[PDB]
Design a protein around this ligand. Sequence first.
Ligand code: HEC
Ligand code: HEC
Ligand code: HEM
Ligand code: HEM
Ligand code: FES
Lengths: 123, 247, 247, 385, 93, 93
Amino acid sequence: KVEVNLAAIPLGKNVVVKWQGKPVFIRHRTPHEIQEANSVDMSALKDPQTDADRVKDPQWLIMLGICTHLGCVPIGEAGDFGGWFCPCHGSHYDISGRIRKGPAPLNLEIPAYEFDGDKVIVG
Amino acid sequence: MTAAEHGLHAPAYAWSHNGPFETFDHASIRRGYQVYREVCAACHSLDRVAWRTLVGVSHTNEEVRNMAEEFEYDDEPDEQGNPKKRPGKLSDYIPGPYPNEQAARAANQGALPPDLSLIVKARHGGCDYIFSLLTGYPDEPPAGVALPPGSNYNPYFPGGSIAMARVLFDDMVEYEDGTPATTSQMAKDVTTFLNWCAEPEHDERKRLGLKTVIILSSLYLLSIWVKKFKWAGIKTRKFVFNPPKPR
Amino acid sequence: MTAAEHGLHAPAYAWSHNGPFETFDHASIRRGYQVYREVCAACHSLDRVAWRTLVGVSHTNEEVRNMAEEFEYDDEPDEQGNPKKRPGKLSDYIPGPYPNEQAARAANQGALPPDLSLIVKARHGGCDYIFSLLTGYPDEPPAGVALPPGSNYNPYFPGGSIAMARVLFDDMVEYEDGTPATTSQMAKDVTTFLNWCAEPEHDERKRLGLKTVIILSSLYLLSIWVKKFKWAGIKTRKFVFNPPKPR
Amino acid sequence: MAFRKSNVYLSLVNSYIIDSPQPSSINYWWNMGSLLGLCLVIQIVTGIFMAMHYSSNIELAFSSVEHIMRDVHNGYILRYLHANGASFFFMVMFMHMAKGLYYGSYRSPRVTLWNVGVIIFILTIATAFLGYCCVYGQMSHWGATVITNLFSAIPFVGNDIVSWLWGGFSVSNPTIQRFFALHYLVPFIIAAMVIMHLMALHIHGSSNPLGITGNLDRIPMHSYFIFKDLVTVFLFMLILALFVFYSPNTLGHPDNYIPGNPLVTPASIVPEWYLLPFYAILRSIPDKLLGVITMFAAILVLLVLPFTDRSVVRGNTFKVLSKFFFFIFVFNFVLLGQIGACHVEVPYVLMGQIATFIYFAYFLIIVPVISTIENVLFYIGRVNK
Amino acid sequence: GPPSGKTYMGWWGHMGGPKQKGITSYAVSPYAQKPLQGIFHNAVFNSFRRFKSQFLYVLIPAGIYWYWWKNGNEYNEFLYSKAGREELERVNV
Amino acid sequence: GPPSGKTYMGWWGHMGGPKQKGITSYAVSPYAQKPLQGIFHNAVFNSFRRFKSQFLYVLIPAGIYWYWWKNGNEYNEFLYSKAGREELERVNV
Ligand code: HEC
Ligand code: HEC
Ligand code: HEM
Ligand code: HEM
Ligand code: FES
C-alpha cells in the first residue's frame, strides 16, 4: 500500500501511478466535465454504471488504467471530450472512465482508495 | 595467546530474557531505542532494521510514523529527471550517520564503527560482552601499557586498545518514564535493544519451541510404549531344544 | 490486425554477413560506430557494450583508450568521503546520454528511446528492419492519415507513427576513409554496427559451426557404415521350415 | 558367471543396456527414447554450467543471461544449446508419444508405462515453462502473468493460490527466484520418473511395429541396438549443431531480447512453440475455468486411450482407417499449434474450436468406432457364412 | 530377493514364446559379407515401393489441413483489408 | 531379469542357514501380555549390570585423553603468562 498525496499536484493535468505493479489514472477534476460525467448515456452504450459508486471523491480520480480489453495503456488528455485515447484497439475514456468505442466489454476497476481527509491515497 | 590479546571474559549477568520461557523486556527495548538514537546513532548504523519492525514491539504506529518522517530518503526523480527527496515511511530502513565507509573512517580517526544490527550475535559473549564493553572503561589504563594516541583502554576488547571512547555517562539521557538513567541502566537498555535488533524472532521462537518440545516428548514416550507393545511377542519368545534322534 | 497495424515488411537486402561462411565487414562496423557516436548517441544508449570489446574488432587499443578517456565515470569516494569522478578505462561501459528514464522521456516528448545494444535481435526482421526503418521515412505521410503532433510517419514501424524523426541526411558525417557518406551508406553502417553489438560472437560462432558440421556429418555417415556392418549378419539371415513329423 | 552379471551395479547396467532382449523387428522410431535420454543429459549439464553464472533477482536475471552470452567463455554455446536443446527435447518427445499411439504401445500390458510417460510429459512442460520464465524477457514476463492468472478462475481459493504462486501481488522478484529454484528441481524429479519409466518398461519389454509377440526371435541390445542408436545420436547432434551454430534464434521469439517491463504489453503474448497447441486449446473455450479444465483434460485424455481402443490387434500397421485418422489427428495438432500463434481474429476462433473438438473426438469417438468397424471388417472379410 | 508377478517376457532361455521345432536359421559372418550391398538399388526401387504404399495416408490429411489453413488465412487477410471492411464489421459486430 | 550371483542371504523360505531340527519356539500375543513389565527392575539392576560390564573400556581412554588435554591446556596457559615468558622464548625458539 503506497499513499500519494494532494497539495503538490494542481488542478487540471494527469498523474498515472504505478502501484503494486499496475498503472492507474489520477486527475484533479474539471467543473462541467465532472458534471458532464453527469451528462452520461445510461445504457444506449455498453454499461449502466455509476459515477458515485465509481469515484467517491467529486474532485479527484484514480482507477485502474489497465485497458479494458485485456491489459494495455492509454494516452493522457487527447481524445473524446478532452480525454484518454487507448490506442490498444482505438478506444476512449475520460473523467469517469466510460466507453464510447470499440470492442471493450466493461469499464475500469477502482481499488479501495481512502483518505487523509478526502485526500486520495490508495490501498 | 596472552589473556591481554584474548580480552577479559565478560561475566554472566542476570538478563531478563535469559531462560527458555523468558521474553524480551519491551520497556527496556523502548528505552534502549532512546539510548541508541541519542548517543549511538552519531557513529553506528542500523541498516538491517526497517521502521515497521518497531511498531507493536517498542513504539506505537504514530510514533514510528513520526520517527520515520523526521528523516529524508531518496525519492524517484520528477518528470524532468532531477533527483528528489522524500520524508520517510514505514517501509524504509533506519539510516546511518555516514554516507559511506570513507566518511566514517574520516570522522572516527581511521576506524570504522560496525553496524550494530547484528552485533550481539557477532561477538563471543553475546549481551554480556556488549554490557561489559560499554561499562568497562577504567579511568586509567593500567601500569605499563603503551597506548597509541586516539585509542582508549577497555580490557574486554581483544588487545585492550579500542578506538571508541567512553560514551555512556550518567544522566545524559532523560527517560520519559522517569527511570534513573545511570551508566549501567543505559547500557542495560541499549544492550537489550541491540539483542532485539539481532534476534527479532526471539519471543515467538521460544513459544513455538515450548509447543514443539511438549509435542515431541509426548510422541517420544508414546512411541516407546508402542514399540514395547509391538515387540512384546519377540521379547517374550521361548526356545526349547530336544536333540533329534539319529538317522 | 490490418497491414498498417502490422507494419510493412522489410525486404531482404544483401548483407555481407548473410550466409553461413560469411563475416561482419569490420570497416562497416568502424564506420557504423562513427555514425552511432555522431548521430545516435544523442538519444540512444549502448548499455551492454564495454569499451574493451571494440579493441581488435573496429578500433586499435589506443584508439579505444582515448575514446574512453574522453568520458567521465563515478570514482570511488576520496579519503574525506566526498564523491569523485574519473576518466574512463577499458573496463567501463559505453555511457548513455541520459541519467535516468525520466530525463529521456522529458527530452524526447514522452517517448523513451530504446537501448540499441540488442535491437537487431529484439525486432522481427533484424538488420533489414533497422535499415528499412531508418531509410523508410517518406517526405509526406499518405493522404488520409491523421498523424498526432510530435510524431512522424514511417510505414515499417508498426502502426505507422513513430516518435523518432528522420535522423539520417546526406553527408552529415564525413568518414575517415573517404567513403561517400549518404543516407543509405550510413544506415548500412549503423545496422552492421548494431548487429555486431547484438551478436559479438558471430564470426567465431560461424567458424566453429563449420568445424562441428563437418565432424558430425563425417561421424554420421561413418556410423551408418558401422551399423550396416554390425547388422549384416541379421539382415542376411535365412529361415527354413521343414514341418516336424506328427508325434 | 560373468562379472557383468555377478555384480550389483553392473547387473543393472547389463540387464538394461547390454543383454536386454529387444525384438529384432523394431524400426528407427524406437530410438526416440535413447534420444530423450541424451537430450535430458544435455539439458542438465548445460543448465548446471549456466547456473554457475546466473543470478536470479528480477533486476539481475536478464543481464545475467547476457553476461553468460557476452562475458562467459563459450557461454553462447551453452545458452543456445540449452534453449534449442529444450525445443529439440520436445520435438523428440512428441515423436516418442506419436510412435506410442501409432503402434499401440499404450495397450494392456503397458498401461503403467504409458501413465508414467504422461507424468513425465506434464513434468517436462512445467520445467520448460519455468525455465522460459527465468530469462525474464518480455514474452517471459507476460507469459508468466497470463499462465498464473489462469489459476484465478477457481471460484473459492483462486486468488490466494495465485498470490501464493506469485509470492506477492504480481510477477516480481519472489516469483523469479521461485521459478529458478523449481526449474532446477523438477528435472531431477524427471530423472527419477525416467528411472521408473525404464523399470515399468523392463518387465514386459518393448513392442514391435507388427504388434504380434516379439518373444520368438530377440537380439541383445549391445552391439546391435547400441550402434543403431548411435546412428540417430549423430544425426540428432548434427541437426542440433546446425540450429545452434547457424540459426540460433530461429525457434525463439525476438521479444525475449527486450527486458521484462510490467507496464508495456507486447501486443501478442505467445509462449514457446511447443506449448502453442495447448495454448490454442485453452484459448478456444469462452470461459477461464473451463479453459484450464479443458487444457488439463487435453493432456489427461492420453489416459483414456487404453480403454477406448476397442480392437484385437495392436497398432495401425495393418489398418487403413486407423492410419488415415491418425494422420488427421497429427495434422490437427499442427494446425492447433499454428492457431495458437495467431491473434483472436475471425476465422481463427472457429478454426481453433473445431480443431479442439477434433482433438477430443479422436480419443473419445474416433478410436472406438474405427476400432469396432475394423474388427468386424477383419472378421467378415475372411470368414465364410 | 522376492519373486515378482508373471510377466510376458522372460530372459535368455525362458523367453515365454511357444515351442519351436523344425526351423533352421543360417547366417554368414559380416566380416565375410559386403555391407552397403544393394544400396543404390534399394535407394530408388524400395524407396519408391514404400512411398507408393504409404503416401495417401499422409498427404490426404496434409492436403486437407493445408487447404484449410490457406483458405482461412486468405479470409483473414481479406477481412482486414480495405475492400473487405463491410463484411468484417458485420462478422464481428 | 537374469539371476545374479550367489549371496549369503536368501528370502523367506530359502534364507540359507543350516537345516533346523528339534527347535520349538513359543510366543504369546502382545494383546495378552503386559508391556512395560519389569521396567523398574531392569532400569536399576540390568542398567547397573551393563554399566559394570562396559565402563572400564570407555572411561580409561576418556580419562587418559582428558588428563592429556587438561595438562596441555595448563601448560599453554602457563607459557603465555607473566611468570612463564622466560620459558616461552627458549621453548619456541
Ligand atoms: C562515536 C564516534 C561512537 C559512539 C557514540 C559509539 N561508538 Fe561504538 N564504536 C566506534 C568506533 C570508531 C568503533 C571501532 C573500534 C574498534 O577498533 O573496533 C566502535 C566499536 C563498537 C563495537 C565493536 C566492539 C568490538 O569490535 O568487539 C560495539 C559493539 C560498539 N561500538 C557499540 C556501541 C554502542 C552499543 C554504543 C551506544 C551509545 C556505541 N558503540 C557508541 C564509535 C562510536
Ligand atoms: C533523438 C531524440 C534520436 C536520434 C538522433 C535517434 N533516435 Fe532512434 N528513437 C528515438 C525515440 C524517441 C524512439 C522511440 C520511438 C517510438 O515510438 O518507440 C526511437 C526508436 C528507435 C528504434 C525502435 C523502433 C522500433 O521499436 O521498432 C530503433 C531501432 C532506433 N530508434 C534506432 C536508431 C538508430 C540506429 C539511430 C541512428 C543515428 C537513431 N535511432 C537515432 C530517438 C532518436
Ligand atoms: C528438463 C530439462 C530442462 C528443460 C526442458 C529446460 C528448459 C529450459 C528452457 C526452455 C529455458 C529457456 C531457454 C531460453 O529461452 O533462453 C531454460 C532456461 C534455463 N534453464 Fe533450463 N531446462 C532444463 C534443465 C535445466 C536444469 C537442470 C537447469 C539447472 C541446472 C537449467 C537451468 C536453466 C537456466 C539457468 C536457464 C536460464 C536462462 C538461459 O540461460 O537460457 N535447466 N530451460
Ligand atoms: C524424458 C522422457 C522420456 C524418456 C527418457 C523415455 C525413455 C524411454 C525409453 C528409453 C524407451 C524405450 C525405447 C523406445 O521404446 O523408444 C521408452 C519407451 C516408451 N515410452 Fe518413453 N520416455 C520418455 C517420455 C515418454 C513419454 C512422454 C511417453 C508417453 C506418454 C512415453 C511412453 C513410452 C512408451 C509407451 C514406451 C514404450 C514404447 C514401445 O516400446 O512400444 N515415454 N521410453
Ligand atoms: S486494451 Fe484498451 S482497447 Fe483492448
